[PDB]
Amino acid sequence: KESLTHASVLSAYTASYKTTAIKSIADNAVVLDIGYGKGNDGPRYAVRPLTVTGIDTAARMLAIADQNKPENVTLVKQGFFTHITKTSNTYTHVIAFNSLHYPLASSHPDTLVQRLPTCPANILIPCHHLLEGIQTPTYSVVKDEDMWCVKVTKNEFIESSYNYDVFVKALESKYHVTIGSLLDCVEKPSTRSITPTLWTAMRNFVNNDQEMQRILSGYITFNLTPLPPKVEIINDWLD
Ligand SMILES: Nc1ncnc2c1ncn2[C@@H]1O[C@H](CSCC[C@H](N)C(=O)O)[C@@H](O)[C@H]1O
Ligand code: NA
Incomplete structure (x- = not known):
């Protein structure tokens, strides 16, 4: 133990994937x-040619986000389904980092996907069925009836189950999908507290810790590009 715990590596790798995704958003999106x-992603949006709408259901957290909100960021307090109905923005890129499993637990996965704007997207989602059992001093995922118990540091969150399989099958109806894991992250997070020496120390710990690789393998990433328009019947016409 020396600033190099399971929760620490997880947030750093999470920070790694957000750095790459936000950077890869097309300019002027x-x-x-x-x-x-x-x-957390404000500083990464602030240094970029992007118009961003940040939505959450928690006002107390949107209050912490306003205290240092970049001006290219507009904050709105409405969940995803209300906002998609009411908004006048046409979105060109969707971001959801450790968030979609909440709406997906109270909706049909095909309804969430068809309601998402038809645009490129990046999704980080925990797959609790790939995380159950992992018990480390700073990270632990355990089953509790129909609900999931997850402990980060000492935070004791409860999350509900969602249908990952149907979710992935719905994305395939709309998107070219490349699936991945946090374990596939190499790029150094933009977080300035993560020095080059510390990142190397984190990635070396991943190469030599089984528990860590399991935690990282259970945080699933989705790089989405919209399929061609339903006029894909022309290509099937080559059968
Ligand atoms: N249906 C919903 N619509 C929008 N935001 C939601 C939501 N359900 C939960 N959330 C919010 O999703 C967030 C996930 S945790 C914060 C995630 C943030 N992207 C980060 O990277 O730090 C929580 O703040 C939660 O309030
Ligand atoms: Na670019």
């Missing part, structure tokens, strides 16, 4: 961040 929360 109108972005929707579903679950903007307390504003």
Whole structure:
């Protein structure tokens, strides 16, 4: 133990994937961040040619996010389904980092996907069926009846189950999908507290810790590009 615990590596790798995704958003995009929360990705949006709408259901967290909100960011307090109905923005990129499993637990996965704007997207989602059993001093996922118990540091969150399989099958109806894991992250997070020496120390710990690789393998990433328009019947016409 020396600043190098399971929760520490997880947030750093999470920070790694957000750095790459936000950077890879096309220039001048109108972005929707579903679950903007307390504003961790503000500094990454602030240094970029992007118009961003951050939506959350928690006002207390959107209050922490306003205390240092970049001006290219607009904050709105409405969940995803209300906002998609009411908004006048046409979005060109969707971001959802550790957020979509909440709406997916109270909706049909095909309804969430068809309601998402038809635009490129990046999704980080925990797959609790790939995380159950992992018990480390700072990270633990355990089953509790129909609900999931997850402990980060000492935070004791309860999350509900969602249908990952149907979700992935619905994305395949709309998107070219490349699936991945946090374990596939190499790029150094933009977080300035993560020095080059510390990142190397984190990635070396991943190469030599089984528990860590399991935690990282259970945080599933989705790089989405919209399929061609239903006029894909022309290509099937080559059968
Ligand atoms: N249906 C919903 N619509 C929008 N935001 C939601 C939501 N359900 C939960 N959220 C928000 O999603 C967030 C996930 S945690 C914060 C995630 C943030 N993207 C980050 O990277 O730090 C929470 O703040 C939660 O309030
Ligand atoms: Na670019």
